[PDB]
Design a protein around this ligand. Structure first.
Ligand SMILES: Oc1cc(O)c(-c2ccnn2-c2ccccc2Cl)cc1CCc1ccccn1
Length: 207
């Protein structure tokens, strides 16, 4: 297991998301589904010129998996996935500029719901989760697990769990008072409200 420090700006963003009083928490789901849709667009585009890029799985979809026993909500996609360099370097490099622009917009009067317009929508997961585990597999790299409970650090390890083929799985270890996001009617409501026109099948699993 390797432990990394978040850049000061991203740690500041995470503390802002965790500490700010903001009731409209449900937008986290739209942000994660939007990320999945973008990663699926990327592999679809690449497969147009190289069909072998789909040897790791032809199906392009998103699954929403609630688990009341584990108190987790998992967002699974079969998108392009992320390499180790994405998890350690590339996400952070992109997030620094996005965070700065988002911070400036917030001071000017914008609200947390607009986070996605700054390319840092993933961190809205901390509105509802105490810990987030991200399992990912890119065609050019091994399967990895990124994890953070915030507090200024994240970990990266090789994942020896069930191999996924290709894509990204975001596991939200929900806060005790945010279990409404495990309810079927609540998730259906949020998907219909914010993610009605996503160009990939969204399957909401039942418990
Ligand atoms: O929820 C996700 C789902 C995904 O499929 C992917 C993904 C795979 C390949 N590209 N891509 C992508 C899609 C849209 C926007 C950015 C990206 Cl990198 C990424 C994230 C969030 C990743 C994340 C983890 C920790 C800290 C910050 N960010």
């Amino acid at each position: 297991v390797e432990t990394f420090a978040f850049q000061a700006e991203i740690a500041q963003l995470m503390s802002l998301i965790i500490n700010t009083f903001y009731s409209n928490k449900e937008i986290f789901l739209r942000e994660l589904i939007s990320n999945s849709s973008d990663a699926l667009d990327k592999i679809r585009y690449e497969s147009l010129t190289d069909p072998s890029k789909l040897d790791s799985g032809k199906e392009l979809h998103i699954n929403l998996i609630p688990n009341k026993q584990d108190r987790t909500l998992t967002i699974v996609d079969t998108g392009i996935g992320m390499t180790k360099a994405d998890l350690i370097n590339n996400l952070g490099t992109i997030a620094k500029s996005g965070t700065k622009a988002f911070m400036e917009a917030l001071q000017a009067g914008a609200d947390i719901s607009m986070i996605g317009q700054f390319g840092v929508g993933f961190y809205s997961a901390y509105l509802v989760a105490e810990k987030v585990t991200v399992i990912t597999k890119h065609n050019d790299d091994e399967q990895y697990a990124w994890e953070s409970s915030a507090g200024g650090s994240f970990t990266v390890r090789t994942d020896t769990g069930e191999p996924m083929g290709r894509g990204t799985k975001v596991i939200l270890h929900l806060k005790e008072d945010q279990t409404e996001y495990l309810e079927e009617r609540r998730i259906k409501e949020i998907v219909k409200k914010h993610s009605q026109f996503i160009g990939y099948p969204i399957t909401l699993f039942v418990e």
